[PDB]
Paper text:
CE clan proteases, specific hydrolases for ubiquitin-like modifications (SUMO and NEDD8) in eukaryotes, reportedly serve as bacterial effector proteins with deSUMOylase, deubiquitinase, or, even, acetyltransferase activities. Five crystal structures, including ubiquitin/ubiquitin-like complexes, explain substrate specificities and redefine relationships across the CE clan.
Due to low-sequence similarities, all structures were experimentally phased (see the Experimental Procedures). The crystallized full-length SseL construct comprised an additional N-terminal ∼135-residue helical domain (see below). The crystal structure of full-length SseL revealed an unannotated N-terminal domain, in which eight helices form a superhelical structure. In bacterial examples, the analogous region is either disordered in the absence of substrate (SseL) or not part of the crystallized construct (RickCE). Mutations in the S1 site of SseL confirmed the Ub binding mode predicted based on analogous Ub/Ubl-bound structures. Likewise, solvent-exposed hydrophobic residues within SseL VR-2 (Tyr183 and Ile196) abolished or reduced DUB activity, respectively. Interestingly, deletion of the putative substrate-binding VR-1 region alone (SseL ΔVR-1) or removal of the N-terminal domain including VR-1 (SseL ΔN) abolished diUb cleavage, suggesting that the disordered sequence indeed contributes to substrate binding. Examination of the SseL, ChlaDUB1, and RickCE structures revealed a conserved hydrophobic region near the catalytic Cys, and mutating residues in this patch on SseL simultaneously reduced activity toward K63-linked diUb, while improving hydrolysis of K48-linked diUb. Ub binding was unaffected with a SseL L46R mutant, but abrogated in a SseL W105A mutant. Therefore, the N-terminal VHS domain of SseL serves to localize its catalytic DUB function through an additional Ub binding site.
Numbering used by the authors: 15 to 136, 151 to 340
Amino acid sequence: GLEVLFQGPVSDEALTLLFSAVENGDQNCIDLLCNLALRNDDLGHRVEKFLFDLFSGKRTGSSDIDKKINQACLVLHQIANNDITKDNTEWKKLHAPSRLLYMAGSATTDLSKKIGIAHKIMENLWCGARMLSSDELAAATQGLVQESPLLSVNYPIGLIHPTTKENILSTQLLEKIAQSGLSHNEVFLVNTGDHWLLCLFYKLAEKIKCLIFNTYYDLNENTKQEIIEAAKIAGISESDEVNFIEMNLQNNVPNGCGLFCYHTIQLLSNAGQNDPATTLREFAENFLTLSVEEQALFNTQTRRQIYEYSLQ
Ligand SMILES: [K+]
Ligand SMILES: [K+]
């Protein structure tokens, strides 16, 4: 029944058939899966994505298919570190930032066998406590909203410039207003040391509303004031109109401030006709009712879905 994988463009159904076979099969089906995702052709590309979507939680799967993927990742790890593969740098999937190389590098805990892999992708890319860089966050948050014209995300900045003490959020706002104006929803991602803040500017019928989403410990009145000063540039009247939503969610999600910024923008993109403050506050409250494992799974899955934008 798997003969259809080699007959013309591969159906989304034929792919589910493949992973159904892997779920119920043994080492042959795993080896077949790896062989197919290693291909340069369109079929290899389709298999590679479907596999990555299951590896990242973008597609749900049985707990049995997750265990097959862990094996596929280990097989690819061994192929990526094999001497034959290293001698043939023309094999793009094994020498470039690919989904396949990322999955391969997630197979052990020995960094000694992830060095070359990491270099080809760009250091421990698979750490669950990585404080996200601005470029990595910029790629993911903006790719996330390509199909949402009403939702605009800006390049991640710091709140205050180190060598001049100037409000950068004040300048980014000014420039965005001059360059394109403020969209229906305007997202600004602002760094305050270790922390990424989600600054959402949204209009409620000719009335600008501001909203700050903090997923760590609460903020200093100093940093809060610098934000408000910037917030007033966008047409916010008095400091009381700025809504600071602050709930620490980063106990079991270390340095996950950028992770929550990403997932938040996704929530806003899929619930367009609603209230941002409610959408976010309900998430943060619901997130605290989850188990340690459900949170650690969010940590892992969001990190993998984020880095996909830094891959080909
Ligand atoms: K957009
Ligand atoms: K705009």
